[PDB]
Symmetry: C5
Subunit: 236 residues, 5 copies
């Protein structure tokens, strides 16, 4: 056949994302009633995260259909909200099953905001692109230190919940690996050679499968797993 | 009268599909509360599948109204999501009533992804149309081997659930026969003489009655049947 | 004043219908939880019927606003779905309160499909307008024989439910009288002198008050009546 | 500053109305679950009334944004539905707490339909504006006689419910005073000097605060009051 | 990079606000079921406030996308509704946990309406900008006197609820500090030098994070805190 053009792929992946995310949202929000009540905030936050994301992709697809332009800087609108919601999920899931300092919520949320807002300043010309990279990468390595070596990590080890053991590990691996895409997108788009925006929209669209959807399913399986482990122990 | 033009049929069948699918979705999601809880994920997945599908048809009808073009390659956006959701339904329904290796979920989902992604590469010019056919047909014969001769089949026979006996058979017959349309659409559109896109949009629209809606109703009757069989046995 | 033009009435009645139907839908779907559970499918089907209908009217009003044309042939999109849903309601309501052969569901649904699809072929030029009339009229007299002289009738008499006695009679009278509009619309528009499309859009819009909304309220009162009769007998 | 133009006010009040009404709707529909079940139809009808109204204002604001015209005759689309729903509320609230002839429902609904349909005929040029006034005013004085001197009045006095005593009085005062706006709008716009349509749109928009929203809150407080009085008496 | 233009920021912050607010709304409305029933009106009012706000931002973003203009006077549409809903929250939260005169509801709501309507008259040219400032500032200092030195304050001290102690303080600090933005916006835009509308849209958008969202979360934590304190005391 005649190859599809990246412009055709850019637009279709906005629809794909839009659909998958509204799907994930509704699923997470209808399955909110079948998990224990200890899991209800986790599931609401999950499902709302997917919805915000979906509304972004709806806004973006219309911009694209109308104009044929979808700047990369627009991605910070989504990430200011949804990357914050995803980081704070670590706290929410821990408060479902153990006791944890509320300080942790704030540590986590600040790191997320630093990581998005720093990269947004370099991207939008308000400060050097070099500096917004460094700040974005610092705000991310902080979040990693929280979850690998900090309170969230310890709380996790000392929870005793085997559902949370698995969520923490899986969510952490997505943030460690999945979320590496964001510093690297930035590095190339800004500090490096540069990258076609079409290419980078495709990349950012296709990685929101991992970074948002698999992230969701991991949370969902924890809530489901746990709900059931509590039922299986009631039987005994 | 003066015959309707296929262009008129193409556009109306997008509306028809849109309506039927939002209908099916809402029905499946409101009837989610009247089935046993063992059936709740099945019903949520069902209803969300219908919703994704509906949102596609909404996206497509607007493209059509605006442009009068509805490429066939756009169908892979729907199928990447909804054909995967339908294949994994076999697993979901089995996990409602029996114990099944989680491996099966992945076998099933990979086959679906191979079958859609392979046919999408040949369709969009990234690899030979011949090869995307072969791969799509392989990804489909795999799914069939799963459900006719593989674990899903055995799990089904050894479940003992008579609701699931009936779902499996009916869902299997739709995949065996209903889903033959997709390899054959592809074969003709790409590897064969060729086919008017209007004609093929009509065909793909009218077969989503079977492939999506009757598929849904089959799942719904199983969940309903079973819910009731459990109530009828509680009375004794 | 200066008379409104039928074009002004055509467009306003699309809005009226749209509003009334989304209203009816939401009401039927929120009152689904206050009827017995034996009535839940009836109420979901009712409310979904109204919703499909509403989405049609939304699609049509946009076509009208944009183009000032609203072909009559577009009505078959609605009727293929909603006339089938309304005919099968007879079965659904009977299965709420008595035992009935599942065959009846199919008898009923085939008649509905014959009646819509036959008149759609004559309307869209695929077969003689004469023949599509005859077939549409045959598919309708069949449905009437079902409900006046056939199993549905007997099941109704032998149910003993006084709520269903009333629904059956009222729904039957709407199909006997209300639905006469459809053969006659067809006869005039196609086989007869002809009729302004504006006039006929107005007529079809204003009769969806009877044919859809009063039809709904009749079903709703049965479910409500019965739910209450069961509560009043529990008190004794 | 430089005065806002009435055109600017007309358009903003459509948005204001739209927002307030979708707000009221959702509130009434979520608070439907916290009132006694005897109040559930009242609350569903309330919330659906607000929703129909909101959908009107959405339809109208788009017409305005596109065209800069919002005829007054368009108001009869809303009023044919929502004035009927509001009049029949008297019956619904009485059937929540006492026994009342079903005849009353019909008396009430006919008066509403006469009052809207008569004024719509004079407005749209089908009969003399004089006569449509007289008929609209007759259909309104009838409704008033029902609720001041007729069965609804008696049923209210003989109910004994103090929540309903208060609703009836408040709803009656809105219909007596609030709804006087409609005959007077009509009189001036048609039978009298005439009135700028911008002015009259503003007036009709700002009076739907009373006539729809305060009307709603009155119903809501009755349902709430009563629900609570029944709980306070259960404690004793 | 090349700096983003304030026009680019104005449009993106409308989307940001839109997304965050629909997010907050849905979260507050799904978490309505996990708080005590004493908190249900608070949570419904909260979530509906967020929704009205979101619908505004949707209306505004379309105006902007179409026209590139977003007058500041449009903000009074939102504030007439949502500032009233936020002020009356003080009453709603007090009626959740203590007994309070219904008079307070009205004191509070009048202050809110005076504060918005006065500033809207000066803004839209109907009265001197000076006078609309004074009135807006008076309507605000009144609300502050209510909540710092008036009944609401006393009711709060005499409630004994420690969740409400915290909400009152936090909501009060947002109104004292957060809401200072509104008098000062007005002062500068109208009575003072003047201010770019782009700048002021950015400022008003970014302060609806505090003034609406943090306001919400404060209410949500009170309802959550309390619900739990009541569960923890039931255990003892
Ligand atoms: C008793 C169980 C009933 C489950 C009802 C769940 C409904 C809430 C989840 C759906 C919310 C969708 C929000 C869409 C908003 C889009 C704008
Ligand atoms: C028991 C202690 C509390 C547990 C649950 C806490 C629930 C909070 C969940 C909502 C957090 C949302 C954070 C969204 C960040 C958006 C920030 C945008 C700034 C521009
Ligand atoms: C301890 C839980 C705190 C939850 C409040 C969420 C604040 C959201 C800010 C954006
Ligand atoms: C919360 C986001 C962090 C942004 C820090 C900006 C630092 C700029 C310093 C040099 C100018
Ligand atoms: C702060 C940089 C990211 C920390 C990574 C974690 C290092 C070791 C974890 C051991 C388990
Ligand atoms: C049992 C495992 C199923 C988890 C859901 C996985 C969904 C992945 C979407 C690509
Ligand atoms: C019976 C099911 C209906 C099939 C499709 C009807 C499509 C008709 C749309 C016609 C649009 C413009 C015609 C002039
Ligand atoms: C042990 C019980 C487990 C039940 C698992 C429920 C998971 C259902 C949701 C699965 C959806 C998977 C298909 C998602 C479609 C998109 C995948 C690839 C897109 C590129
Ligand atoms: C899991 C999805 C994989 C689908 C495509 C697999 C095959 C890609 C093409 C291989 C041959 C290229 C030469
Ligand atoms: C020609 C105009 C639009 C083409 C849309 C292409 C869709 C590309 C993305 C498909 C992703 C699913 C592949 C499996
Ligand atoms: C019950 C008999 C099963 C025969 C299976 C036929 C082959 C399935 C699909 C091809 C692999
Ligand atoms: C038992 C009879 C119900 C059958 C399920 C509905 C089929 C719908 C087909 C369109
Ligand atoms: C009694 C209610 C019936 C309403 C019928 C329809 C009236 C709609 C009129 C819309 C007029 C638009 C343009 C008029 C100039
Ligand atoms: C046995 C208990 C009752 C179960 C019946 C469930 C009925 C579900 C609704 C049936 C749907 C009717 C068919 C609507 C679509 C018609 C097919 C369109 C073909 C183009
Ligand atoms: C499901 C019923 C479909 C409608 C009946 C169609 C009959 C067509 C007869 C054609 C005769 C051609 C000469
Ligand atoms: C030109 C009119 C001819 C109509 C033929 C009569 C068919 C009526 C249906 C018979 C049952
Ligand atoms: C009551 C008994 C009615 C008998 C006659 C019904 C005739 C309707 C059949 C139409 C063909
Ligand atoms: C007791 C009244 C029940 C019927 C209500 C609806 C009547 C039709 C509405 C038009
Ligand atoms: C206090 C409520 C104010 C309602 C009217 C607001 C109208 C403003 C719209 C102006 C847009 C163009 C300048
Ligand atoms: C017990 C849980 C309470 C959930 C109630 C949810 C249903 C009420 C909200 C329905 C909103 C309907 C709005 C549809 C608008 C269509 C256009
Ligand atoms: C309790 C017995 C009487 C029934 C009470 C409910 C009345 C029917 C529901 C209201 C129907 C709304 C009609 C709107 C007209 C347009
Ligand atoms: C003036 C209108 C009177 C309508 C009521 C008729 C009686 C209906 C009985 C049921
Ligand atoms: C001279 C013509 C006299 C016409 C009178 C028209 C009366 C219409 C009143 C509306 C009735 C609505 C049904 C109740
Ligand atoms: C009885 C209600 C109507 C009386 C007014 C008749 C019209 C007066 C002429 C203007
Ligand atoms: C309670 C006192 C009722 C006094 C009489 C009220 C007259 C209302 C009549 C309305 C016009 C017919
Ligand atoms: C009983 C406390 C007062 C609640 C009043 C309900 C809202 C009043 C009208 C809003 C405008
Ligand atoms: C993290 C900060 C989030 C605020 C985003 C500011 C708006 C960016 C939108 C830019 C639109 C670009 C058009 C060129
Ligand atoms: C069992 C829990 C179910 C809660 C469902 C209700 C949650 C609120 C959904 C309301 C969303 C309304 C969307 C606005 C419609 C108009 C735009
Ligand atoms: C127990 C006493 C009752 C407590 C609950 C009262 C519920 C009130 C909730 C609604 C208040 C909204 C009032 C502001 C709406 C905007 C008014 C705009 C006027 C132009
Ligand atoms: C409550 C309504 C608040 C309105 C405040 C406006 C007062 C206007 C004073 C004008 C003086 C010339
Ligand atoms: C309290 C009074 C509000 C301030 C008014 C100061 C005078 C304004 C003109 C500069
Ligand atoms: C809460 C104890 C401190 C009292 C502060 C009094 C001043 C409050 C602001 C009033 C505005 C007029």
């Amino acid at each position: 056949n005649s190859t599809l053009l990246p412009t055709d792929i850019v637009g279709g992946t906005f629809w794909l994302l839009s659909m998958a995310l509204i799907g994930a949202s509704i699923f997470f929000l209808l399955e909110r009633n079948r998990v224990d009540g200890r899991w209800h905030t986790t599931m609401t936050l999950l499902g709302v995260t997917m919805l915000i994301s979906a509304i972004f992709y709806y806004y973006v697809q219309g911009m694209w259909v109308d104009t044929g332009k979808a700047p990369i800087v627009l991605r910070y609108l989504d990430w200011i909200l949804t990357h914050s919601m995803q980081v704070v999920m670590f706290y929410v899931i821990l408060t479902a099953v153990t006791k944890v300092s509320s300080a942790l919520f704030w540590r986590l949320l600040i790191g997320a905001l630093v990581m998005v807002i720093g990269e947004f300043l370099g991207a939008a010309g308000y400060m050097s692109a070099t500096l917004g990279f460094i700040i974005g990468v610092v705000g991310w390595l902080y979040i990693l230190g929280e979850i690998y070596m900090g309170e969230a990590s310890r709380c996790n080890i000392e929870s005793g919940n085997e559902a949370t053991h698995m969520a923490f590990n899986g969510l952490r691996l997505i943030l460690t690996i999945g979320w590496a895409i964001y510093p690297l997108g930035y590095f190339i788009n800004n500090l490096g050679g540069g990258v076609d925006a079409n290419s980078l929209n495709i990349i950012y669209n296709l990685t929101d499968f991992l970074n948002k959807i698999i992230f969701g399913f991991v949370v969902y399986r924890a809530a489901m797993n746990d709900t059931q482990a509590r039922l299986d122990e009631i039987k005994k």
